[PDB]
C-alpha cells in the first residue's frame, strides 16, 4: 500500500487478502476436525471418569 | 437512475491518458478519474473549432 502505485497496489493487496484468508480458512477447518478428535477424546476419559 | 456528464478540451496524449485506473500527468493535476467507474469515455478531434 505505501509502495505500489495505486491500483496495482489494490489489486495485488486483493490476491494478498485472499491468501490470508484462505490460510485463516484452512486453520479453522483443521482445528474444526481436530475439535472433533479432542471431543470424542474427551467424550471417552469423561465415560472412563 | 443517474448519468453524470464531464464536458472538457485537452490534447491527444491526454485522451489517451484518461481512463479509470489511469495514473499519470492528466489524470492527476487536471482531470481525475476513479479506479472504479461504470460509464463511457468519448472523444472527437476539434481541429476545426
Known sequence: ???????????????????????????????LIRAAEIRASANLAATKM | ????????????????????GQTGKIADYNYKLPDDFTGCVIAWNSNNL
Not at chain 1, 509502495?3 to 489494490?10: G, N
Request: charged fraction near 25%.
Open chain 2, 1 to 20: 437512475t443517474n448519468v453524470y456528464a464531464d464536458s472538457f478540451v485537452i490534447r491527444g496524449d491526454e485522451v489517451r491518458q484518461i481512463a479509470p
Open chain 1, 1 to 31: 500500500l505505501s509502495r505500489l502505485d495505486p491500483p496495482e497496489a489494490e489489486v495485488q493487496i486483493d490476491r494478498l487478502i485472499t491468501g490470508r484468508l484462505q490460510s485463516l480458512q484452512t486453520y479453522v477447518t483443521q482445528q
